Design a protein around this motif. Structure first.
Motif, mmCIF file in Angstrom:
data_model
loop_
_atom_site.group_PDB
_atom_site.id
_atom_site.type_symbol
_atom_site.label_atom_id
_atom_site.label_comp_id
_atom_site.label_asym_id
_atom_site.label_seq_id
_atom_site.Cartn_x
_atom_site.Cartn_y
_atom_site.Cartn_z
ATOM 1 N N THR A 1 35.423 19.694 32.829
ATOM 2 C CA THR A 1 36.542 20.559 33.156
ATOM 3 C C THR A 1 37.819 19.734 33.098
ATOM 4 O O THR A 1 37.844 18.593 33.550
ATOM 5 C CB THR A 1 36.362 21.151 34.584
ATOM 6 O OG1 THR A 1 35.286 22.098 34.573
ATOM 7 C CG2 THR A 1 37.635 21.830 35.073
ATOM 8 N N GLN A 2 38.873 20.307 32.534
ATOM 9 C CA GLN A 2 40.149 19.614 32.432
ATOM 10 C C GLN A 2 41.161 20.383 33.256
ATOM 11 O O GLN A 2 40.892 21.509 33.670
ATOM 12 C CB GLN A 2 40.601 19.553 30.971
ATOM 13 C CG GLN A 2 39.710 18.697 30.085
ATOM 14 C CD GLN A 2 40.033 18.834 28.604
ATOM 15 O OE1 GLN A 2 39.680 19.833 27.964
ATOM 16 N NE2 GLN A 2 40.713 17.832 28.053
ATOM 17 N N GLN A 3 42.315 19.777 33.510
ATOM 18 C CA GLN A 3 43.356 20.444 34.280
ATOM 19 C C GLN A 3 44.713 19.847 33.936
ATOM 20 O O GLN A 3 44.817 18.670 33.594
ATOM 21 C CB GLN A 3 43.083 20.314 35.784
ATOM 22 C CG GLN A 3 43.759 19.139 36.471
ATOM 23 C CD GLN A 3 43.354 19.018 37.935
ATOM 24 O OE1 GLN A 3 42.258 18.551 38.254
ATOM 25 N NE2 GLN A 3 44.234 19.452 38.831
ATOM 26 N N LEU A 4 45.754 20.667 34.003
ATOM 27 C CA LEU A 4 47.093 20.192 33.690
ATOM 28 C C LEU A 4 47.673 19.667 34.993
ATOM 29 O O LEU A 4 47.750 20.400 35.977
ATOM 30 C CB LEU A 4 47.948 21.339 33.149
ATOM 31 C CG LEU A 4 49.237 20.947 32.425
ATOM 32 C CD1 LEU A 4 48.892 20.196 31.151
ATOM 33 C CD2 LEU A 4 50.047 22.192 32.096
ATOM 34 N N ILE A 5 48.069 18.397 35.007
ATOM 35 C CA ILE A 5 48.615 17.806 36.221
ATOM 36 C C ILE A 5 50.106 17.520 36.131
ATOM 37 O O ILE A 5 50.706 17.031 37.085
ATOM 38 C CB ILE A 5 47.876 16.495 36.590
ATOM 39 C CG1 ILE A 5 48.269 15.370 35.627
ATOM 40 C CG2 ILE A 5 46.367 16.721 36.538
ATOM 41 C CD1 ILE A 5 47.639 14.023 35.964
ATOM 42 N N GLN A 6 50.706 17.824 34.986
ATOM 43 C CA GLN A 6 52.134 17.599 34.804
ATOM 44 C C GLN A 6 52.657 18.418 33.628
ATOM 45 O O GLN A 6 51.899 18.756 32.714
ATOM 46 C CB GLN A 6 52.411 16.114 34.551
ATOM 47 C CG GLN A 6 53.894 15.775 34.407
ATOM 48 C CD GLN A 6 54.132 14.363 33.899
ATOM 49 O OE1 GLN A 6 53.632 13.387 34.469
ATOM 50 N NE2 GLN A 6 54.906 14.248 32.825
#
Length: 115
Positions: free
Chosen positions: A53-58
């Protein structure tokens, strides 16, 4: 499916030597100070991931990192929940319970700083 092998260092939570805190009240044995050691307990351990799973952190610019993944470890490996694993300079904590499937330890790892 393709199964690339990754390498990580593992750190186990450990009870720290009793140290009276706040006015030095005597430390409770049934409530030790839990933390990780300076150096890895296990080193360069082989594993592979699935359910990544990936996620946008910026944003502006964008930044995407892995949020979590199901880690597969050799059965001979010492795997414990709340373990801290370091893969490519990032910290991960083993969260949900682990289990045995296909002669491997399976356990979910979650991005440290998202806890």
């Amino acid at each position: 499916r393709q199964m690339l092998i990754h390498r990580c260092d593992i750190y186990h939570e450990a009870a720290q030597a009793p140290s009276a805190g706040r006015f030095g009240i005597p430390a409770d044995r049934l409530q030790p100070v839990i933390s990780y050691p300076d150096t890895p307990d296990e080193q360069d351990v082989p594993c592979y991931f699935t359910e990544k799973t990936q996620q946008l952190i910026q944003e502006e610019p964008d930044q995407t990192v892995y949020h979590s993944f199901l880690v597969h470890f050799p059965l001979s490996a010492d795997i414990r929940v709340n373990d801290k694993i370091i893969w490519e300079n990032h910290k991960y904590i083993l969260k949900l319970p682990k289990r045995i499937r296909h002669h491997h330890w399976e356990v979910v790892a979650v991005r440290d700083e998202s806890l």
